């Protein structure tokens, strides 16, 4: 089988990508940050605090006749921007573009963080990082990749995020017209239960390739691109009054500047991010001074190859026996 859902952001700076996804019976569509950094399929629902619900589409379980709550379980997490989110669980049918899970655990929040009430726009996320990070207690679950796997024509899904523009998630096989040239592949660790890998370097614009080894995680839950202080100081020095801000929280540049692009190395392969992709607009409502899409990770504890970078390719989650990542040109 395979499934094929196409996939918008959220705003006009790509801030994030919703993916609609129907669950129970009848269907019940979410749109959903579909998030390769983390393994929890988790939903606005009827028992979301009223407080904490501001605009999104919720799930109610009592409507759906394949819904059956998972006794005893709850689940708790806390992601890299200070977000947050818990609640009970429920096994339920759940699928996207046309590619259809049963018995899929669909986690109703009970409570959220500010930010995700906040955002109207996103009804949950759907995590696709290996089931080891699912936080579902006592019994952990797996993911809507990991349950349909088997049934995949080809164990794998990819992601090809657009830029301003829809995009699309497919799953089970690989579009041959969607990406220009061919996929060079790479080597995965899932030692954290990320889809970690390692670039073999950089370029700023123009200039000269340098190889160095950037361990990183391929996210799509994460909106910029954080690199280490080195590479991203070298990045920001290529701009005109370019500077880092303690007061924003990152490096700030000139809302009048034309930006450089940023080359990343797979293998051999050099992935282009557009300078126009690297524009956050201003920073606060009238501003004429910008936020950077290249961020430095040092205070992270990761790189994180997060919507920027993953939108200037067409990007291949291979689950295969050893699972690995394919970067391509698009
Ligand atoms: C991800 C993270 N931070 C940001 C954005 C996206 C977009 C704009 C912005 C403006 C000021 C500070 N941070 C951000």
Same mark, same amino acid.
């Not at 918008?8 to 994030?16: C, V």
């Given at each position: 089988?395979?499934?094929?859902?196409?996939?918008?952001?959220?705003?006009?700076?790509?801030?994030?990508?919703?993916?609609?996804?129907?669950?129970?019976?009848?269907?019940?569509?979410?749109?959903?940050?579909?998030?390769?950094?983390?393994?929890?399929?988790?939903?606005?629902?009827?028992?979301?605090?009223?407080?904490?619900?501001?605009?999104?589409?919720?799930?109610?379980?009592?409507?759906?006749?394949?819904?059956?709550?998972?006794?005893?379980?709850?689940?708790?997490?806390?992601?890299?921007?200070?977000?947050?989110?818990?609640?009970?669980?429920?096994?339920?049918?759940?699928?996207?573009?046309?590619?259809?899970?049963?018995?899929?655990?669909?986690?109703?929040?009970?409570?959220?963080?500010?930010?995700?009430?906040?955002?109207?726009?996103?009804?949950?996320?759907?995590?696709?990082?290996?089931?080891?990070?699912?936080?579902?207690?006592?019994?952990?679950?797996?993911?809507?990749?990991?349950?349909?796997?088997?049934?995949?024509?080809?164990?794998?899904?990819?992601?090809?995020?657009?830029?301003?523009?829809?995009?699309?998630?497919? +799953? $089970?096989? %690989?579009?041959?017209? *969607?990406?220009? =040239?061919?996929?060079?592949?790479?080597? #995965?660790?899932? @030692?954290?239960? !990320?889809?970690?890998?390692?670039?073999?370097?950089?370029?700023?614009?123009?200039?000269?390739?340098?190889?160095?080894?950037?361990?990183?995680?391929?996210?799509?839950?994460?909106?910029?691109?954080?690199?280490?202080?080195?590479?991203?100081?070298?990045?920001?020095?290529?701009?005109?009054?370019?500077?880092?801000?303690?007061?924003?929280?990152?490096?700030?540049?000139?809302?009048?500047?034309?930006?450089?692009?940023?080359?990343?190395?797979?293998?051999?392969?050099?992935?282009?991010?557009?300078?126009?992709?690297?524009?956050?607009?201003?920073?606060?409502?009238?501003?004429?001074?910008? +936020? $950077?899409? %290249?961020?430095?990770? *040092?205070?992270? =504890?990761?790189?994180?190859?997060?919507? #920027?970078?993953? @939108?200037?390719? !067409?990007?291949?989650?291979?689950?295969?026996?050893?699972?690995?990542?394919?970067?391509?040109?698009?």
């Amino acid at each position: 089988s395979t499934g094929s859902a196409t996939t918008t952001p959220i705003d006009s700076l790509d801030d994030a990508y919703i993916t609609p996804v129907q669950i129970g019976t009848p269907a019940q569509t979410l749109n959903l940050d579909f998030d390769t950094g983390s393994s929890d399929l988790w939903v606005f629902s009827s028992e979301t605090t009223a407080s904490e619900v501001d605009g999104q589409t919720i799930y109610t379980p009592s409507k759906s006749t394949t819904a059956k709550l998972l006794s005893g379980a709850t689940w708790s997490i806390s992601y890299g921007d200070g977000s947050s989110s818990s609640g009970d669980v429920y096994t339920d049918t759940v699928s996207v573009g046309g590619l259809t899970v049963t018995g899929q655990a669909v986690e109703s929040a009970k409570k959220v963080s500010s930010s995700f009430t906040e955002d109207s726009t996103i009804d949950g996320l759907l995590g696709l990082a290996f089931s080891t990070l699912n936080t579902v207690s006592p019994t952990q679950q797996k993911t809507f990749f990991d349950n349909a796997k088997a049934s995949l024509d080809s164990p794998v899904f990819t992601a090809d995020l657009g830029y301003h523009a829809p995009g699309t998630y497919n +799953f $089970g096989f %690989i579009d041959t017209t *969607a990406y220009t =040239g061919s996929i060079t592949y790479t080597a #995965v660790s899932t @030692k954290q239960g !990320f889809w970690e890998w390692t670039s073999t370097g950089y370029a700023v614009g123009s200039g000269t390739f340098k190889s160095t080894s950037i361990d990183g995680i391929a996210d799509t839950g994460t909106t910029l691109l954080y690199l280490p202080a080195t590479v991203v100081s070298a990045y920001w020095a290529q701009v005109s009054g370019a500077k880092s801000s303690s007061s924003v929280g990152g490096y700030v540049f000139p809302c009048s500047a034309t930006l450089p692009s940023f080359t990343f190395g797979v293998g051999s392969a050099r992935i282009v991010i557009p300078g126009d992709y690297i524009d956050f607009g201003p920073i606060s409502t009238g501003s004429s001074s910008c +936020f $950077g899409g %290249i961020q430095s990770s *040092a205070g992270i =504890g990761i790189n994180i190859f997060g919507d #920027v970078a993953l @939108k200037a390719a !067409f990007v291949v989650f291979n689950g295969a026996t050893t699972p690995t990542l394919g970067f391509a040109s698009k």
